[PDB]
């Protein structure tokens, strides 16, 4: 969907952004520093949920560039093996969102951000 | 969810971005030069019907910046029907799509455009 390389950029660089976003803001929430109310958090992960599967389709071969390293297209199967694993614990985040249950909600949370860390570790420019 | 206004004008952008993203990226089908896969674009419109639902809160008060028009504010109620219907013609392309319909599908998309357009011309500045 990407006239030129460019606007591939651009669009994982926007799902990014969201991502964090819905990510981040549930971390007062996890650290009990702002209240725990199921419904809303159920409904913002399942935001976050249609969100980190988009970046992915935005690393077609050709479109280097950005702060993604050349590794994601020489390692293509390892890559998606880390954005696979990642939409997996995504999956373990909504199970938890779904439950209703804090806790499990805080030890799935915390699951993501090490996988998010993870790729950016290997993948990700300084 | 927003530390400063600036958070809130970046997120606005991304989702927007976005948003041009999945509702472009069919104009080649509603106007025949790619193929119709209903199923395809069931699942397109899914995505721009989450995305198309994101702006709306991330204009909230102190959020002035970027280009919107400062009437975004000084003018809730009126911003407030321009956002609802945009997202009422998104629920009617969505029923579009779901029914596999491709001349229901191009007269819909017709009406989302021009509801995109309305509201920039209203509230986005040059
Ligand atoms: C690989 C499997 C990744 C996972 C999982 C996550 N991210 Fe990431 N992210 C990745 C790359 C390769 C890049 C650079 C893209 C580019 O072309 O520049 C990024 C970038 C970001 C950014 C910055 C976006 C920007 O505005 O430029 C953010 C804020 C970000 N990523 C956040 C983020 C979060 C919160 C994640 C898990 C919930 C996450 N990413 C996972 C690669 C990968
Ligand atoms: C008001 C009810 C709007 C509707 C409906 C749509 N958009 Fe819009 N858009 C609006 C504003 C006020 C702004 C400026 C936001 C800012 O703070 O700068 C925008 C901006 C955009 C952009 C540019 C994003 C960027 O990277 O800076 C795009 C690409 C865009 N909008 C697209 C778009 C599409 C495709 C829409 C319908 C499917 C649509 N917008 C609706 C206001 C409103
Ligand atoms: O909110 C975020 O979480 C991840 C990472 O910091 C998790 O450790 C990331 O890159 C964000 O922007
Ligand atoms: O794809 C887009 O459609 C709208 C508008 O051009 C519809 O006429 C817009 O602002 C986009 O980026």
Chains 1, 2 share one sequence.
């Not at 935005?58 to 390293?69: I, K, S, V």
Request: charged residues 25%; proline residues 5%; hydrophobic residues 40%.
């Amino acid at each position: 969907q990407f006239a030129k390389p460019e606007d591939a950029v651009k669009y994982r660089q926007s799902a990014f952004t969201l991502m964090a976003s819905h990510f981040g803001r549930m971390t007062p929430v996890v650290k009990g520093q702002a209240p725990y109310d199921a419904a809303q958090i159920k409904a913002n992960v399942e935001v976050l949920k249609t969100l980190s599967a988009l970046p992915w389709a935005a690393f077609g071969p050709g479109t280097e560039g950005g702060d993604a390293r050349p590794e994601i297209w020489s390692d293509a199967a390892s890559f998606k093996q880390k954005q696979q694993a990642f939409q997996d614990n995504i999956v373990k985040l909504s199970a938890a969102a779904d439950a209703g249950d804090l806790d499990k909600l805080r030890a799935a949370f915390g699951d993501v951000g090490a996988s998010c860390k993870a790729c950016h570790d290997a993948y990700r420019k300084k």
